[PDB]
């Protein structure tokens, strides 16, 4: 067959990065391809469009075949709240070389692996999993409201109502509420959050 398959991948050392105010942060990047790739690393605000007051070093480089390298993340400015987390996205775009050459296709890809970059002020102590039991759940109609009274982003891994999973989950920002679609349930609510180290927490249980 005429046209070749494009396979393309990039490996990140973690699925989130916690930027602890008092200390810069790091993120590993690896190239599973047998050829060099270009790596462009940027940080976007929570709107996923506006550029954030953080830079990645190196911001643009060529990663060799099979090479693993460490990126450094630095807060450059901005006025960060001192009493709650701030969420950004660090996006690692990877681009292969152009391919070497009836009707045929020359198929190629560009991929972007984005991780939450969560800025944690010094005054915000502990981790979200310590207080994720404090999420409140209120049913109104076919919608489930979750209230987060804590200074952390709550990055839900899982919510089930009567064993029925909720999909289209979104993070719950600090001191804020979010609305989820009821999964046709109910009574018993179980939730897990993704921890600072990428694993799922133990479940928390609540009854409405």
């Amino acid at each position: 067959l005429n046209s070749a398959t494009k396979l393309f991948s990039v490996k990140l050392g973690a699925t989130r990065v916690i930027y602890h105010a008092g200390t810069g942060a790091t993120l590993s990047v690896s190239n599973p391809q047998n050829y060099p790739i270009l790596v462009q690393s940027s940080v976007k605000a929570a709107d996923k469009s506006s550029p954030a007051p953080f830079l990645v070093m190196p911001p643009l480089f060529r990663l060799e075949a099979n090479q693993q390298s460490q990126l450094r993340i630095v807060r450059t400015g901005g006025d960060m709240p001192t009493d709650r987390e701030t969420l950004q996205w660090v996006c690692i775009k990877a681009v292969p070389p152009e391919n070497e050459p009836g009707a045929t296709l020359d198929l190629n890809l560009s991929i972007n692996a984005c991780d939450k970059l969560i800025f944690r002020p010094d005054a915000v102590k502990g981790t979200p999993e310590d207080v994720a039991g404090n999420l409140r759940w209120v049913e109104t109609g076919n919608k489930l409201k979750v209230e987060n009274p804590t200074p952390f982003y709550m990055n839900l891994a899982s919510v089930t109502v009567g064993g029925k999973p909720i999909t289209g989950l979104e993070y719950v920002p600090p001191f804020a509420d979010k609305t989820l679609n009821m999964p046709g349930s109910h009574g018993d609510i179980e939730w897990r959050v993704i921890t600072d180290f990428g694993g799922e927490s133990h479940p928390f249980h609540y009854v409405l």
Binding site: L1, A4, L109
Partner: protein
């Protein structure tokens, strides 16, 4: 599974001369054990929609254009359209595969090599 892995796979059908209407020409597969959804746009000289899901691509040797894009069945699989980095992205469940077709009415295609590049984004939960 750990890592973002994307395959763009050519499918049998594309030929020089008259093609079947909406003929499939490629298949997109996005694999990650942690991702729930992805966005995809064609990377292109031109765009027909604000979503970058239909565009024209020119042959390397002749410069003749073909129209390509997501099948109308792939499009119906979209969950939402989001604005990410200044542009509209259609989002998809990371468990769906998508089809790229020759768009619109039957196309008469000149023997050439046509480059197609797709840009894929995954925001990790």
């Amino acid at each position: 599974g750990s890592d973002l892995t994307v395959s763009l796979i050519p499918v049998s059908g594309l030929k020089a001369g008259k093609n079947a209407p909406s003929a499939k020409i490629a298949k997109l597969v996005v694999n990650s054990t942690t991702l729930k959804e992805f966005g995809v746009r064609g990377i292109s000289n031109n765009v027909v929609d604000s979503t970058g899901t239909a565009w024209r691509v020119a042959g390397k040797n002749t410069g003749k254009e073909i129209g390509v894009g997501l099948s109308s069945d792939s499009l119906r699989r979209s969950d939402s359209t989001e604005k990410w980095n200044g542009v509209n992205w259609m989002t998809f469940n990371s468990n769906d595969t998508l089809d790229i077709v020759l768009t619109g009415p039957a196309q008469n295609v000149t023997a050439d090599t046509y480059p197609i590049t797709l840009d894929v984004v995954g925001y990790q939960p």
